[PDB]
Amino acid sequence: VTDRDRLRPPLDERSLRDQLIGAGSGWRQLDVVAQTGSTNADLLARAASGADIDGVVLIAEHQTAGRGRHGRGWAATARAQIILSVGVRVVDVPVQAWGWLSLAAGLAVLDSVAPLIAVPPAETGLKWPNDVLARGGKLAGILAEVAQPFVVLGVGLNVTQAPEEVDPDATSLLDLGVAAPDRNRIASRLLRELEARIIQWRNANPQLAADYRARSLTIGSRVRVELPGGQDVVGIARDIDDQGRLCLDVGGRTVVVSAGDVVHLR
Ligand SMILES: [N-]=[N+]=N[C@@H]1[C@H](O)[C@@H](CNS(=O)(=O)NC(=O)CCCC[C@@H]2SC[C@@H]3NC(=O)N[C@@H]32)O[C@H]1n1cnc2c(N)ncnc21
Questions:
Q1: DSSP letter (8 states) at residue 176
Q2: Which atom of ligand 1 is nearest to the CA of 40?
Q3: What's 34's domain CATH number?
């Protein structure tokens, strides 16, 4: 709505750089662009042209051709979200562990906005694999894409984004009760949390898996998992394995899923 536009001041690039670039911080480069097609596509293009995108941060005020998992889109309007992509060098890490990098990102996003909520409503946590939920609504979506030797981590976090603007099952910090969300503070918290989780992932820290399970909305729930190819599997989510894959209990049989869409059942 037009009223929410007043609640959407521009990001401060200079200030974010002062806070996030320098001693004690792994981020080497940060840019805020007014608009782009897809921040993920941009960092992928940079890498494909020889640039070292490790520790590089790209933030867009607006994204006109956003991308979701397996061919889907991501909708946004100007200054209503935190829209960023991050480059991570991964070649030094075994390929089996790359799946955990995306789980780590969602954990970082959740922890960056969790205390801003007045009281924990039902369904505030992480849905496997790339979903930050709050009150059942999708608060943020994570997209990891490969460009050797890097992985580009993308985050779309609904700050003041109205569900009617993007998606019916969406929610935002504003629609959760946060009156005047400051994207500068939130982005700063987010990238600081993200830095910690990436280091943890890179060093195979046990705390990463433990912290994920503690915030998982999926583990322990009856779920319908829509597999790639259109097949549905119904069971009970039990655990995450060492590759970040979802372990399903289907009537006593174990089904391990590497990718798919999860729906929490009654
Ligand atoms: N159901 N469905 N429909 C929409 C779409 O089909 C679906 C896609 N979700 S998804 O397949 O699990 N993928 C994701 O959640 C990952 C999205 C990553 C976006 C980030 S933003 C910066 C970076 N650059 C990119 O191009 N992508 C990444 O989410 C719905 N959707 C679109 N915009 C949304 C909304 N702003 N908030 C919540 N949900 C919404």
A1: G
A2: 24
A3: 3.30.930.10
Up-side HSE of residue 25: CA atoms within 13 Å toward CB?
21
Resolution of the structure in the document, Å? 2.3
Do 87 and 182 lie in a common domain?
yes
Q: How far is ligand 1, taken at its centre, from the CA of residue 99, in Å?
A: 18
Rounded to whole angstroms, how far apart are CA atoms 49 and 29?
17
**CA–CA dist 255, 162 (Å, integer):** 37
**Does the C-beta of 163 come closer than 6 Å to ligand 1?**
no
Q: Which residues contact 112 (CB under 8 A, 6 or more apart)?
A: 186, 189, 190, 192, 193
The residues with which 33 forms a beta bridge, in sequence order, are 60
Of all protein residues, the one whose alpha carbon is nearest to atom 29 of ligand 1 is 74
Q: How many CB atoms lie within 10 A of CB 117?
A: 16
